[PDB]
Amino acid sequence: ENLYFQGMCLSIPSQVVAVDNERQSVTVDTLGVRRDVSSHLMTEPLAIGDYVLIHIGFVMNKIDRNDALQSLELYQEIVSKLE
């Protein structure tokens, strides 16, 4: 699963070349092209010289139910306005 960046594209092992934990970012090199990326979804702490496989994904964060319920009316109005 972790091999697939998305369903029809193989992740390329990428070397970690910089780590900035105070700014939650890491720089990776993928076949020589460098990209700085947010490190919020790294699955364990990383260091220079580690190799990673990367995929677009997500994690689920809880939100207070009352805040969710109050905000949802605005989300529905947006959908109504833009569909």
Added chain:
Amino acid sequence: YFQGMCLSIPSQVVAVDNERQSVTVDTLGVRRDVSSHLMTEPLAIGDYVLIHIGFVMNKIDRNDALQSLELYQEIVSKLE
């Protein structure tokens, strides 16, 4: 970073299967099953969640990565 391009929609947990370790969420009427391992903290039925999208990174063994990269390079030389 690209999470900055969209607003996560509050989504209700509408089913929980602990034998499969999955949950179902509902986002304005549309339901999806998601792995429970993706919870950042304990969720229960009826809770609301917001996803955080981004690049998930899995560390792999350096030697495996380095040996495989010859094959990636070979594909690139051939296609691109």
